[PDB]
């Protein structure tokens, strides 16, 4: 259960509460940020890549 499971995450019918978030780059169901549509893992990868517009290291 992983391939047929990233299917349902985009399928989204039948009751509105059965629909859930899901990382697009991966298939992660946990720690999925609504802002990017990505898991915390993928988000970190791309942020170091530079492929995340404006996204920058936080030092203060």
């Amino acid at each position: 259960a992983r391939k047929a499971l990233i299917e349902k995450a985009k399928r989204t019918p039948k009751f509105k509460v059965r629909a859930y978030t899901r990382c697009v780059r991966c298939g992660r169901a946990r720690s999925v940020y609504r802002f990017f549509g990505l898991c915390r893992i993928c988000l970190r990868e791309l942020a170091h890549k530079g492929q995340l517009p404006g996204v920058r290291k936080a030092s203060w």
């Binding site: 942020a47 890549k49 530079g50 492929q51 517009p53 920058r56 290291k57």
Partner: peptide
């Protein structure tokens, strides 16, 4: 740390530059 992300700001600019 990723030597690219470690810069980003000063030295080494982005790779996808758009605002929304």
């Amino acid at each position: 740390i990723h030597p690219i992300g470690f810069r980003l700001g000063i030295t080494r600019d982005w790779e996808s530059r758009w605002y929304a």
